[PDB]
Design a protein around this ligand. Sequence first.
Ligand SMILES: [Cl-]
Ligand SMILES: [Cl-]
Ligand SMILES: [Cl-]
Ligand SMILES: [Cl-]
Lengths: 244, 244, 244
Amino acid sequence: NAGLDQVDPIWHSIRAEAEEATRNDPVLGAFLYATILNQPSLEEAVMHRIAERLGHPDVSADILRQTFDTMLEANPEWSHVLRVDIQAVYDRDPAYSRFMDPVLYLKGFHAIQTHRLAHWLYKQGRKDFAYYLQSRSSSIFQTDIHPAARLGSGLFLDHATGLVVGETAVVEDNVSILHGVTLGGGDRHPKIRQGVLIGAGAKILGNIQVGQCSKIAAGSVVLKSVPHNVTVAGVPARIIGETG
Amino acid sequence: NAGLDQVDPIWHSIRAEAEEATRNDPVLGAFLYATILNQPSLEEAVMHRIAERLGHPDVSADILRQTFDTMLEANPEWSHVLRVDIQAVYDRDPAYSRFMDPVLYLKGFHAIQTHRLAHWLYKQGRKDFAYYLQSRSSSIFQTDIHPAARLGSGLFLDHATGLVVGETAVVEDNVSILHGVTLGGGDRHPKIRQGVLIGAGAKILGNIQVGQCSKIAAGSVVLKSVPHNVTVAGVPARIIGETG
Amino acid sequence: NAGLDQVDPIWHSIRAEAEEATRNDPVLGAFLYATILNQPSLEEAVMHRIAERLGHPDVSADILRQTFDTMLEANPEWSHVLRVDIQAVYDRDPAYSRFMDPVLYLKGFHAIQTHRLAHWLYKQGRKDFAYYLQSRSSSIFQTDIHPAARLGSGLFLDHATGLVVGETAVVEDNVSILHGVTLGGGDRHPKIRQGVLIGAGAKILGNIQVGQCSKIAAGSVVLKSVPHNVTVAGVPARIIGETG
Ligand SMILES: [Cl-]
Ligand SMILES: [Cl-]
Ligand SMILES: [Cl-]
Ligand SMILES: [Cl-]
């Protein structure tokens, strides 16, 4: 509408990718037009997708979409957060070559933003709506994230199935978390510092911290804080080397 | 209606909690009135919620609700079981401060009672209905519990995602079981004695027993019977201390 | 219709099993007639079930069923593949005594065939339809299988919850894979040779191979190729014995 905001290569690429896909598979036209092409913005596309996935007789897509609208209005920074979350997927995963892929398909990405809505509702004292969302996400996306948990931006929830994040956990920016991960057990759950990779099935338990840029090997059981710039593996986890 | 049965602090608290929540977030009114406030009893509230979550074109909420009614009629003790299952959640989990939370939201609690219905159907020789329920629960609650499995009362299925319970398994009373747990492999699956805690991701395999009050650390692989009043951890599991 | 194809003991047994079940529980009549008895073939029964489970407002059962039809037409060998996949379940699992059980109920079996459809679509350059299916299956069946992955016949996906299979993975024939398994990380994911059993929660990571007839113990973390005819266990996995 005016100024630097008009530069939006991610949205423009997504719109191009949906145009080309509908051309290639016209039966998917209702899907791609309703989710992307008929949308006035990437924000609305992402809200709409997630409201559609979570929508139920119990609480309709429309109500979820209306509430998402209220959250964007109160949290204008969500425009950037969602784009860098998108960017994380694109940069960190060779499996998917389009910006549209996380928006349409990847439940990890849908669960992140669902949590962001739930967290805001929770903070506003709308705790039933926050628990409803937590419950719905746990059932549909298989991600159980307590609404009081704090998630940074550029988070990559890869595959996602089985993720459990406790009430007092904190995840900072540019973290990647695989499927089957527990951030579990006043302050009694983990603090994950920026740039961390958490591998498949890892359990990180207690009020401990995982230092910046560290890697948690698949299947690790982490019961003690991890220094920055190390790789840890094993049950129980031990430092096995350095990393950048 | 008469006598000691009229004392029902859990139901009364739930009804108060739903009244207050609808007041605080009126859009959730359809939900809270249909699930709690319009219900004549806690039994009906819990049946209704679970029938709504599992309801599908294939087999409707109403049919599931009618069958749940038949199960309560045959199994009048379910009134108590469901209340002590509720109580377990309230007592054992700091994350949720209301009795209504497991009833409305927590799939673990929904899966326990779904299993109870499936088990009864199985015993009655209604094995397709029991397998249908098992299948539905596995898909929606991510809990795969064979209908022939036997679950005690006051069970806390915390987070629940990925639970697998085999045909010959037995869980006694006051057990807590986290997400990602396998009770797996004549008698070929585990017997879990009363008061046991099973941590996230543990696999307990074979016709072995876990003694009363014992704890299974997150990520343990248990291939041999565990004595009462010990903590075990590791792959393979070893006793690491005593506990009460 | 003519010749050796008329011999179809699996379909005939299924039809008998559905007739008997509807008799025993008539409320399940809509289900059993729509899924089995009104079907002209086992192929159509399996397509119909899976299209019903995956069907959504976003993309309807009918469209999924029409696309499944196109896949069978192009891939006539699916008739055999689906029967030997059925046979695998029947032979390898004591919990279920009917051929109809995997067809109606077991999400593992539904996810295998969903992948087969997604893979074909992917190869045809219908990558959005393939990703949509992958996404839907991940959400409903809790199986995340990249469409470029290659799965052999007679595969038994037992319990299935949490399965993650990467883009370059290969699974050969007569493999069994439990819940919670990762075949994860050019060629960067595992090659599983024929006759392998992969136990609950195992993670097999990298461009490594698991030799013919080998067993992967529950909870193993496999970072190096495994010889044929051995059992491996532990974090990290070590050979613990021979097997046939
Ligand atoms: Cl935000
Ligand atoms: Cl009962
Ligand atoms: Cl095929
Ligand atoms: Cl899982």
